[PDB]
């Protein structure tokens, strides 16, 4: 997310076009975007086409034009000169394709080469008509799109979704790296900058969880502090963990400490889970997802989120506010975790409604009711000329207090005018995975969790191994993202390992396989790049040769399908099911942020309707289309009660509450207050609006 916020080309802003006034022609992909802007990665909201991303190899001119590199070919021989061409010069020449064959010196093998001509034309020209060539396939894609394995088997809508969901994944507490990745994950992790990189070679002298000090080759040393448990801009955690031992020799540019979402230096946004691609009893109907309880017990998809709460004690007209334990009339139960200046103790558990900072403001003099004065005279309490306005934990939140940062005026901290003290409290909590949370893979396959089953009622292999996630079959073929199925197949082969039997020579499907992809050990990490990767013939061969588990028991056959048992009935499922290892990641759309409710809360000021938003209590909106649905049903009483004594009827709101609490019948409604505000605005435009009797 950080690296893709830079390298962003937004077409809107002060000096460029608006969003509503922008045509449908500037939101298009043009053939001069090849190598300069990514056709895939763009928002899917009402900004599609107006925000894009720079491609991987692209440069920017002195004048502001985007260039892209090309290999100069002369007399049909592709040389190693790299020329950076902007779109005009590219229109003047004719540019080949990066995967056209080469006869080991640069000379083209085929007689006619597929090219790109001046207007977006694609033709076949003779091999000496060509005068440039792309430096790579995946020249046209961006950073977040070059991390989708098997991209050319996914449709462009689902690739757009996958690239945009890849930068919403949250950092987990352990963070392992994918079995099948592309090669982009290392460079996107070093270049993003959340990794600590050794600036100069040396030998590690002393490691702790807080620092690494390396001693360079000429006497001098350098210590690198780590950022432990720091709140990012969006609430997540920003841990940094060393990965070097205490006598290790490091080199310049070597990753010396990890980051939020990296494992051994490369970007790791999710976890590798064992998947089954069946339907299962309706619990994964229409993109819902079934999960194991192992992922809750073993903290697989668990993440840490930090919140920051701030109060300040400034000067008023009637005196100065102060931060104190001596709050007005509340019990000594709720003053238990507060230290002797009115702030919470570090380590203390807080619930919704607990005092964090005890503040009090000077109130002045008011007239008390006779009932309140009689109660004060009975119980002997005093007036308490100060009014309690403390900082409390908001609704639905909890966690442990992990840090307090207090600034003061008398200690010459730079606070704004009026403010005498400022206190910040940090409350961190560790969130397990629960249903309602949203997960995704890299191929655009999102979905909320519907059920978290026990381990024992999960489909299991003949080994006894339960599956970890169940995904539905009906969602795959109408979306055209079988990159997820080919990733599942390769992930099973990378988990189990393989060995190609080159006894009677290399088999015919493995003629173009690189050597030492001809065998792999269990849990091998492999990499299929974007437009140059593993073919389907190679996936077929690697499925047909793969290692047994512990006994000689090849559990997944040559089609990629396994025989499973039902965890509840015990009987075997009657047909083989596709299993493998898909790399899924947990998205920042969790239930604990989404849920709100309200019975009665804050109201607006001019019109007296509820405020809106989860940050308030906040009402839900009942708009025009909902009113038309109520009128179409015929529900005059439901519609009237929603539009009067639940929004605007200021004297009817209170009688409704009193009638519910006393158990009576809900009273009759009155005039909404927005109608009276309308009549006063119509009168103040010099119109004589009047209500008549009969």
């Amino acid at each position: 997310s950080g690296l893709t916020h830079k390298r962003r080309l937004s077409a809107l802003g002060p000096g460029g076009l608006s969003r509503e006034r922008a045509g449908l022609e500037v939101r298009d992909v043009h053939p001069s975007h090849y190598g300069r802007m990514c056709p895939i990665e763009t928002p899917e909201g009402p900004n599609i086409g107006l925000i894009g991303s720079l491609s991987v190899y692209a440069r920017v001119n002195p004048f502001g034009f985007i260039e892209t590199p090309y290999r100069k070919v002369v007399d049909g021989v592709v040389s190693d000169e790299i020329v950076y061409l902007t779109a005009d010069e590219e229109d003047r020449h004719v540019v080949a394709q990066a995967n056209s064959p080469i006869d080991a010196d640069g000379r083209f093998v085929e007689p006619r080469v597929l090219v790109r001509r001046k207007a977006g034309e694609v033709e076949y020209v003779p091999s000496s008509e060509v005068d440039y060539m792309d430096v790579s396939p995946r020249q046209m894609v961006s950073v977040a799109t070059a991390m989708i394995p098997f991209l050319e088997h996914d449709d462009a809508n689902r690739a757009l979704m996958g690239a945009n969901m890849q930068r919403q994944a949250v950092p987990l507490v352990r963070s392992e790296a994918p079995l099948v990745g592309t090669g982009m994950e290392l460079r996107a992790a070093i270049d993003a900058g959340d990794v600590v990189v050794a600036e100069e070679s040396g030998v590690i002298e002393e490691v702790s969880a807080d620092y690494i000090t390396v001693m360079h080759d000429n006497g001098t040393r350098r210590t690198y502090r780590m950022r432990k448990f720091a709140r990012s801009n969006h609430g997540t955690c920003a841990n940094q963990c060393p990965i070097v031992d205490a006598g290790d020799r490091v080199e310049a540019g070597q990753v010396i400490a990890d980051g939020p979402c990296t494992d051994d230096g490369e970007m790791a946004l999710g976890k590798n889970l064992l998947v089954a691609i069946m339907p299962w009893e309706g619990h994964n109907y229409e993109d819902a997802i079934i999960l194991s309880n192992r992922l809750v017990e073993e903290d697989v998809l668990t993440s840490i989120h930090i919140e920051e709460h701030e109060i300040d004690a400034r000067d008023t007209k009637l005196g100065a506010e102060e931060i104190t334990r001596d709050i007005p009339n509340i019990s000594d139960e709720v003053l238990a975790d507060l230290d002797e200046r009115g702030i919470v103790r570090i380590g203390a558990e807080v619930r919704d409604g607990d005092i964090l900072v005890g503040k009090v403001t000077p109130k002045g003099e008011t007239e008390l009711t006779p009932e309140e004065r009689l109660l004060r005279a009975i119980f002997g309490e005093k007036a308490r000329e100060v009014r309690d306005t403390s900082l409390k934990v908001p609704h639905g939140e909890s966690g442990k207090v992990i840090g307090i940062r207090v600034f003061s005026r008398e200690d010459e901290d730079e606070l704004p005018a009026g403010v005498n003290e400022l206190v910040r409290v940090y409350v961190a909590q560790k969130r397990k995975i629960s249903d309602g949370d949203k997960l995704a893979g890299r191929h655009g396959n999102k979905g909320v969790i519907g059920k978290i089953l026990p381990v024992e009622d999960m489909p299991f292999l003949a080994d006894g191994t339960p599956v970890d996630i169940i995904l539905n079959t009906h969602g795959v073929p109408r979306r055209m993202n079988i990159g997820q199925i080919l990733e599942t197949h390769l992930g099973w082969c990378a988990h189990s390992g393989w060995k190609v039997d080159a006894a009677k020579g290399v088999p015919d499907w493995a003629a173009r396989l690189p050597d030492e992809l001809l065998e792999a050990q269990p849990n091998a990490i492999v990499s299929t790049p974007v437009f140059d990767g593993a073919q389907e013939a190679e996936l077929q061969g690697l499925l047909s040769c793969t290692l047994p588990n512990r006994d000689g028991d090849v559990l997944v056959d040559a089609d990629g399908k396994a025989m499973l048992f039902d965890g509840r009935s015990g009987e075997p499922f009657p047909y083989p099911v596709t299993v493998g290892y898909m790399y899924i990641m947990k998205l920042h759309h969790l239930v604990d942020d989404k849920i709100h409710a309200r019975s009665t809360g804050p109201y607006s000021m001019i019109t007296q309707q509820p405020l809106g938003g989860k940050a308030q209590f906040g009402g839900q909106r009942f708009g025009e289309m909902e009113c038309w649905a109520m009128q179409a049903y015929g529900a005059a009483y439901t519609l009237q009660e929603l539009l009067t004594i639940k929004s605007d009827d200021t004297v009817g709101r209170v009688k409704v509450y009193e009638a519910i609490v006393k158990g009576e019948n809900i009273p009759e409604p009155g005039i909404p207050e927005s109608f009276k505000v309308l009549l006063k605005e119509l009168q103040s435009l010099c119109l004589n609006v009047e209500v008549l009797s009969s």
Binding site: D191, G265, V526
Partner: peptide, 26 residues
């Protein structure tokens, strides 16, 4: 390769790369 302590991730790719990826914050 070209990163001094990178983990060995074996590649299915078939083509040689003439140009390395630039700095991505240039």
């Amino acid at each position: 390769n070209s990163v001094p302590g990178a983990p060995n991730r074996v590649s299915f790719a078939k083509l040689r790369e003439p140009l390395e990826v630039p700095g991505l914050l240039d």
